Design a binder for this molecule. Structure first.
Ligand SMILES: Nc1ncnc2c1ncn2[C@@H]1O[C@H](CSCC[C@H](N)C(=O)O)[C@@H](O)[C@H]1O
Ligand SMILES: Nc1ncnc2c1ncn2[C@@H]1O[C@H](CSCC[C@H](N)C(=O)O)[C@@H](O)[C@H]1O
Ligand SMILES: Cn1cncc1C[C@H](NC(=O)CCN)C(=O)O
Ligand SMILES: Cn1cncc1C[C@H](NC(=O)CCN)C(=O)O
Ligand SMILES: [Ca+2]
Ligand SMILES: [Ca+2]
Lengths: 347, 337
C-alpha cells in the first residue's frame, strides 16, 4: 500500500518531466494560431513575431533535454530499482515550471541575492549557536526539511556541520539528485526559466534569456564533510525523539496540511537544548485545494503555539524582505516580508 | 443586443447577492477542519472559533454594503470568476476612495495628472474646452481628479461590477468616511496578526460632490471601442492599468489613434498583465513593451515622454506578508497635427 502508491506517484512525476515539451509547444502553437488570425496588416507591424516564436521553441527543446537527463538519471539509480503513458495534469506542469525556476534560486549566480536574503540569516544563526571555537561542527547534527534543490543544506555542509537535507517531492528529489551528483563542472548546463512568461516583458529577448548552473561545484565539499539527502515525509522518517541539535526550515512550514503537526514533530526530535531556526512567510500550500486539510494560522497564532509547547524565543525578526524565484526583468514582481526566528528547546 | 445585455445584468446582480453565501461556505470549510482536529490541538487556540465568528460578521457587513449598491442601482450560485471579480471590486474601494489608497494613487494617478497639466496649461487652453477620455475608469477616482482640475473629463467603463460601484460612490455618497468595508477578510494566508484580516477601511476619503462650478464630469457604460467611433474628437486619452485588458492591444492602439484630434495626446501608465492570457477559447495577443512601442511608432505617434520602471502597486494589503508590485511604463505620445 505504502510502496505501491509511492510507485504510482513516482512514474506520474516521470511522465510529467517527459511531457514538458508537448505542453509548452501547444502553448506556443496557440499563440502562432492566434497571431495568424489577425488582419494581415497588423501582422506586418511585427515582422519578427514568428521568428521570436521559433526561438522560444528552441528554448523549449533545450529545457526538455535537461528534463530528460534528469529522468534518465533517476530511472537507472542504484536505489531506485524498487519502483520497476498519459498526459500530465496542468498542476504537474505548473510544478515543473516551478522546478526550473528553482535552479536559478539554488544553483545559479543569478540567484545569489535571493540566497543572501534567505540563507545567510539562517547560516548566520547556526554559526552563532555552534561557534567553531567551541564546537566540533562534525558532531553537530542539523536537519534541513523541505530542502528543495539542496543549496542551503549544502552550504551548511560546507562549514563542516553534519547536515542532512530531507525532501518529499519527486520534482525536487529528481533535480537535486542530478545537480548534486552529476554537475561537477561550473556553469556547464543552461536552461530558460522564463519562456513560460508572456506577460510583463520589457523586451521580447527577456523571455528567452538563459541562466547557467551550477555556479559552484557540489563536489567541492571538503573532506570531513558529512552531507546527505533523504526522500520521504519528514514526519514519518524522523520519528526518533531527542536527536537533532538544530532543525532549519526555509519557506517550509506553510507547506503543511497542519503546521501544528510540524511544530509537534520539531519539538520531539530536537535534542534538549537544541534550536529550531525558521525563515519564511505563511502562504498555505493547501489553502484552496478541495478535499485537503489546511489549517491556516496567523504568525501571531504560530508563536502562541510555539510558546505553549515550551520553546523559548531567542531571535525574532519580522519584516525580513526576500523574493522567491523572482524574474528581475519582469514588469510584475512579488516579494515576502518573512519572519525569522530562533527558538530553543529547554534542556 | 438588448437580450444579451439583459442576461449580463442579472448575472452580476446575482453575483452581488451570492457574496455572503460564497464566503460563509469558505469559512465553513475552515471550521469543519478546525473542529476535526484533536481536542489537545484545538485547546492551543481558544480564540480560533471566536475569530471565525468575527470574520462572519465582517462578511455579513460587506454583503449589506453590496446590497445597498444594488438597490441604489435597481439567488443562484455564481462562478468563482464572478466572486473573484467581486472581491477585486471591494479592494478597488480602498484604491480609489480611501485614505489608505493615497500612496497607490500618488504613484499611479499623479504622474498622469502632472502630464495633463503639462500639455494643457491655461496659458494655451481653456481647460473646460479640453475633452479628456478615461477608458476603464473603474471607480472613476482618476477621471474625477481630472474633472476636478476644470477639464471636460469623461470616464468610461465596461464592467458592471465597476459601474454599480462607481455610480453608488459618485452619486449616492456625500458624507466623508460614512461607509466601511472589510476588504481583506478573504485572505487567510500571510497574516501577521489575526486582527489584520478583519481590519476595516473607510470611504470616501474626499467628498465627490465637491466639483467646482462649470465642471464637466461624466461616466459612460460599455465597450470603449464600440461607444467611441467619432474620429478626431478627443484632446487627450488617459489609460491607467488599462491597455493590457485588450484581447488585442493593437486594436486599442488603433481606436486611440483614430479618435484623437490631430495634436491629441495619449497618456499611458501601467504594466502588461494580459487579462485573457490563461483563459481558454479567448483571443489574447501578448506583446512585449518593445513590440507595443514599435507598433505605436509605425502608426505615426511622436513620443514625448517614456519612463520605464515606474514603481506602483495595485490593491495591496500593506500588512500582508506577501506583496506584488509593478515596474510600470509611463508614456505620452502625440498624434501629429
Ligand atoms: N511533508 C514534507 N516533508 C518534507 N518536505 C516537504 C513536505 N511537504 C512539502 N515538502 C517540500 O518542502 C519544500 C519547500 S520549498 C523550500 C526549498 C528551499 N529550502 C528554499 O527555501 O529555497 C517543497 O520542495 C516541498 O515539496
Ligand atoms: N473595452 C473596454 N471599455 C471600457 N472599460 C474596459 C474595457 N476593457 C476592460 N475595461 C475595464 O478596464 C478596467 C481596468 S482596471 C483600471 C481602473 C483604474 N483606471 C485604475 O487603474 O485604478 C477594468 O475595470 C475593466 O473592466
Ligand atoms: C515555497 N514557499 C513556501 N511558502 C511560500 C513559498 C514561496 C513560493 N512562491 C513562488 O513560487 C512565487 C513568488 N512570488 C510558492 O508559491 O511555493
Ligand atoms: C487592473 N490591471 C490591469 N493590468 C494589471 C492590473 C492589476 C490587477 N492586479 C490585482 O488585482 C492584484 C495585484 N496585487 C489585475 O490583474 O486585475
Ligand atoms: Ca518581436
Ligand atoms: Ca515558424
Amino acid at each position: 500500500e505504502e510502496e505501491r502508491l509511492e510507485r504510482e506517484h513516482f512514474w506520474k512525476i516521470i511522465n510529467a518531466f517527459r511531457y514538458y515539451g508537448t505542453s509548452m509547444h501547444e502553448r506556443v502553437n496557440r499563440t502562432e494560431r492566434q497571431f495568424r488570425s489577425l488582419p494581415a496588416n497588423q501582422q506586418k507591424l511585427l515582422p519578427q513575431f514568428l521568428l521570436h516564436l521559433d526561438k522560444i521553441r528552441k528554448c523549449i527543446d533545450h529545457n526538455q533535454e535537461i528534463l530528460l537527463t534528469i529522468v534518465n538519471d533517476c530511472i537507472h539509480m542504484f536505489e531506485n530499482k524498487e519502483y520497476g503513458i498519459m498526459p500530465a495534469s496542468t498542476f504537474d506542469m505548473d510544478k515543473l515550471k516551478s522546478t526550473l525556476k528553482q535552479f536559478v534560486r539554488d544553483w545559479s549566480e543569478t540567484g545569489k541575492a535571493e540566497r543572501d536574503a534567505c540563507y545567510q540569516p539562517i547560516i548566520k544563526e547556526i554559526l552563532k549557536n555552534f561557534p567553531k571555537e567551541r564546537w566540533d561542527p562534525s558532531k553537530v547534527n542539523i536537519l534541513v526539511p523541505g530542502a528543495g534543490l539542496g543549496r542551503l543544506a549544502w552550504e551548511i555542509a560546507m562549514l563542516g556541520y553534519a547536515c542532512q537535507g530531507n525532501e518529499w517531492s519527486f520534482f525536487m528529489l529528481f533535480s537535486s539528485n542530478f545537480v548534486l551528483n552529476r554537475c561537477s563542472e561550473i556553469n556547464k548546463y543552461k536552461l530558460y526559466p522564463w519562456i513560460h512568461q508572456f506577460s510583463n516583458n520589457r523586451r521580447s529577448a527577456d523571455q528567452i534569456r538563459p541562466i547557467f548552473f551550477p555556479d559552484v561545484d557540489p563536489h567541492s565539499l571538503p573532506p570531513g564533510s558529512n552531507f546527505s539527502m533523504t526522500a520521504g515525509d519528514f514526519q514519518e522518517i524522523y520519528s526518533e525523539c531527542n536527536t537533532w541539535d538544530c532543525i532549519a526550515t526555509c519557506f517550509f512550514i506553510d507547506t503543511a496540511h497542519n503546521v501544528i503537526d510540524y511544530i509537534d514533530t520539531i519539538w520531539k526530535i530536537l535534542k534538549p537544548g537544541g534550536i529550531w531556526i525558521n525563515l519564511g512567510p505563511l502562504l498555505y500550500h493547501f489553502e484552496n485545494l478541495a478535499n485537503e486539510l489546511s489549517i491556516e494560522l496567523s504568525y501571531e497564532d504560530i508563536k502562541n503555539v510555539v510558546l505553549q509547547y515550551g520553546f523559548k524565543v531567542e531571535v525574532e525578526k519580522e519584516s525580513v524582505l526576500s523574493t522567491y524565484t523572482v524574474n528581475d526583468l519582469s514588469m510584475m514582481k512579488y516579494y515576502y516580508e518573512c519572519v525569522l526566528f530562533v527558538v530553543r528547546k529547554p534542556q
